[PDB]
Design a protein around this ligand. Structure first.
Ligand SMILES: [Zn+2]
Ligand SMILES: [Zn+2]
Ligand SMILES: [Zn+2]
Ligand SMILES: [Zn+2]
Ligand SMILES: [Zn+2]
Lengths: 481, 4, 481, 163, 4, 4
């Protein structure tokens, strides 16, 4: 009927199968082991081989190379390596079944059902909705009955990420401020009725004196929205929450400090800060974690017009500070000035904001790990340890006064929204946000280098990666335990 | 996204 | 006769003087305390005030603000803050004496004679030699007889840095490969006769099959030099050494992948990798540290000509690997490929290379800390702890296989000297060097964001900063103890 | 015949110089048929031939120019007029003083693809032992910036007298 | 020094 | 190769 993804490790005397693979070989009376031998060189990790008609039920059987059985935490790479081996291997195996146009697959748990489910649900995702020319939708299920809640924990974690990838990948004319708030809203309520959504309009934002955010949204005719999500997971309702904040620019053209044409279409994903944190709240609520979490996301477009922000303008943040808006394409800073002052209202335990903030983070680490600026090494350590697990790596960046300085010397105002130099572009923008944060446990995750995948993360196809939504979910899980 |  | 720099802390009942300052006030029968009161608002840290004719011997007395008496290691900034307070304050005080055209100054030890001597000898330096229009050369001495070897340890550490700043600041037509080797050579022999210098010519480099380094030097008519320094400080001559490697491009024009005109004069400091490590060997030998250290520095210019390197060329490194030279302005990589294979010859304990390698490190951290890529968290930790002390900060950067990949996929060759993308520019160049390193304790310090000072480090005037020569000297001191 | 051309083109210009290119084509043409003659004409010949326009380009580099001349005598009558092929042989085009941008200038190692293509086809015509006479002509030099390169505005005289 |  |  269907397909079957099966694993095997690198040599012992004979490279060894997963116990599911060994079982299946016994079931077809040694025929898998035999056809593997006839097919030639052994399967190294991530690689694939397909075998036809070994069993009446699995006419296509894909054997995937899982590398070393005992691969664990790598000190150099800072991740569990086995989990990463398995994500890439069952992603590759699953896409081979899909190219065979087979609608269903049974996936080998590979000794870690959670990492097996993450490779298949992440590796098979595309965002197909607007092409009439689509791939067969395959349905991936666990090959077995034994480790079920781990496999479904993987399905949970990976679907939390794929929500983010879909929120990001959708063209900005469909994923506007209102549309984004409405999809997150429904996704949060289906996850738990211990939720409340507030899709706050322009009049509220005005009443909230969020003039820095309003200054950015004015150039467009698309209405701003301030999204506020609550997941009431603690037994006591009066437990202080963990707050998440995210940049929600649904399209960044730069405005009057207009962007170059080349590849500005990827700016439809400049709400990836709001996608990532909102997907993790949806997944925390699905996981029904015993914690209270608020989700905050300013959503607007940044367009040029006869009423847009002009370079040089001084706008007042909620907290009374004035910002000189020297460059209109440093709008995340602005939107986040106001949303971060608002987070202190909730009396948080932790404030975590995420944002596709600077191209300089991309030049920096950009691609291999998201940069996290934190005044809390406790919080740094928490995110970093969750990162080992998920494999969706995080790397620390300096939150030194030296950078504050380059943003504090300012002609008309209290803070300038851009530094005098090109140097340390992501550290200066981090210094701008700290100006709007008094909290002792604050992390700023600059997600701009991890916005996209090409080939680097094996189990993700080309397009918006939804990174780092799983490191964020893992952090909340561990924080709740 | 500014550039650099 | 002379001037006197005196310190004071921020309030207690009356802000308190250093005991030298209190003594001097008693000596002029309370007149300093009295004129300070009449002069108005208290001196915050780094700030200065000058008082005339308080004493027959010190007709100019500059009182410098030292901030909080008990300021120590800051967790957010990762440095001793008091040491940093003192460096900036006696640098500012000393430059006030120099503007008074006073040739000598007595400097208050400020509770830390080493940090007091570092602010004065670093803060007073310029590189004056080619202007006929110069500032008075002032002679800075300790105000007292009590803590002498700490003050002279400061003079040592700061002169080790100022050597580097002079090696870097000198116009490349004077600081050529031969000239650089000859100044380091003399500076190392004056430091100790337990030294050997080898200013290896082109014929040796050719014999050593350093084709990647030779490929870069050929476009210029200025001769290449491979500098090899030895400091034999251990009791046993057979102790394995610590090896340092440094990029010595005496001018980087880019070659055929030619640089833009704007500010390409700062490329005279692209031998700042060789300046930094060579100054630290000179200072280790002056400190007469009980360790063995080899200093390795390939020195050449990178010019366009009818025989320069062409984009696309494949050259063979000493280790047999081929490099495709896709961009001629990624020459540090090349010079360092060969010098780093050569470092394994010495059978090292540690291999530390430094280099003004990429502009991407400048966009990254660039300015606030030098980036260190290491396969050794032990070594990371050593450099980082020395950095707290010196205040000349270091920050870790990823040495992940993901980046190796972007440099390993290569059309004609084993390694390409540049990655397909702009992303993670300093991590890809670090990945290129690791291809030429088998050693378990290797650190690559990319010094390009700390090549220059403008205003950021208070105790350094504008120009080549010689960073991080003191963190390197501190590392060797602690390593030797 | 095509894969020869792809190899002549793909090889880094520091290995596939004017002399090297002429020498690989030369051997490839003689193995194809002994009804061949190769002339790897040096700078002195090119000078004697008053090819000042070609010489103007080759001067900026220290890599020597070569004017490659190939003959395949395939007709029964030696006096049959030939088919002539000509091909551009710049072994690396940096642009010279009108210098190229760094981005992807490594593909300019294949700017002798005019000389590779036509020379590979003569080698294959001779292998096929086609009953025709064919001459192969390819000026081979690099185009580099230097203290003696061509300057924008310079007037040079072609073999035919035009400036 | 390459740029980026 | 000129450009255009
Ligand atoms: Zn922007
Ligand atoms: Zn943006
Ligand atoms: Zn360069
Ligand atoms: Zn360089
Ligand atoms: Zn051309």
């Amino acid at each position: 009927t269907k397909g079957l993804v099966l694993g095997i490790y690198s040599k012992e005397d004979e490279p060894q199968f997963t116990s599911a693979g060994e079982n299946f070989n016994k079931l077809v009376s040694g025929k898998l082991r035999e056809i593997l031998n006839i097919s030639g060189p052994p399967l190294k990790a991530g690689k694939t081989r397909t075998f036809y008609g070994l069993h009446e039920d699995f006419p296509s059987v894909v054997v995937v190379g899982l590398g070393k059985k005992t691969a664990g935490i790598d000190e150099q790479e800072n991740w569990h390596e086995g989990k990463e081996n398995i994500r890439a291997a069952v992603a590759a195996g699953c896409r081979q079944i899909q190219d065979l146009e087979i609608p269903s697959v049974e996936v080998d748990p590979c000794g870690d059902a959670q990492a097996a489910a993450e490779g298949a649900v992440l590796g098979l995702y595309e965002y197909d909705d607007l092409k009439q020319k689509r791939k067969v939708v395959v349905s991936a299920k666990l090959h077995g009955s034994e480790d079920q809640e781990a496999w479904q924990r993987g399905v949970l974690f990976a679907s939390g990420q794929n929500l983010a990838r879909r929120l990001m990948e959708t063209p900005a004319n469909e994923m506007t401020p209102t549309k984004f708030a409405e999809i997150v809203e429904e996704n949060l309520k289906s996850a738990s009725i211990k939720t409340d959504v507030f899709i706050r309009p322009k009049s509220w934002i005005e009443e909230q004196e969020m003039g820095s955010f309003l200054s950015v949204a004015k150039g467009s005719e698309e209405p701003p929205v301030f999204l506020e999500i609550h997941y009431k997971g603690s037994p006591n309702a009066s437990e202080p929450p963990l707050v998440f904040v995210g940049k929600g620019i649904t399209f960044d053209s730069g405005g009057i400090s207009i962007k170059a044409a080349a590849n500005m279409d990827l700016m439809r994903a400049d709400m990836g800060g709001a996608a990532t944190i909102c997907s993790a709240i949806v997944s925390a609520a699905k996981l029904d974690l015993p914690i209270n979490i608020v989700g905050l996301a300013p959503l607007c477009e940044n367009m040029p017009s006869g009423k847009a922000n002009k370079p040089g303008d001084v706008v007042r943040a909620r907290n009374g500070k004035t910002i000189q808006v020297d460059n209109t394409d440093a709008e995340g800073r602005l939107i986040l000035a106001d949303a971060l002052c608002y987070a202190h209202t909730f009396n948080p335990k932790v404030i975590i904001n995420a944002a596709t903030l600077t191209g300089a983070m991309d030049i920096a680490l950009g691609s291999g790990a998201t940069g996290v600026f934190t005044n809390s090494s406790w919080l740094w350590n928490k995110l970093f340890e969750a990162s080992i697990e998920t494999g969706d790596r995080v790397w620390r960046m300096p939150l030194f006064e030296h950078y504050t300085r380059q943003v504090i010397d300012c002609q008309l105002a209290d803070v300038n929204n851009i530094g005098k130099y090109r140097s340390a572009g992501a550290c200066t923008a981090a210094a701008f946000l700290k100006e709007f944060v008094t909290h002792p446990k604050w992390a700023h995750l600059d997600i701009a280098g991890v916005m996209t995948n090409k080939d680097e993360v094996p189990y993700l196809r080309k397009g918006m990666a939804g990174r780092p939504t799983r490191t964020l979910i893992e952090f909340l899980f561990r924080f709740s335990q | 996204x500014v550039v650099d």
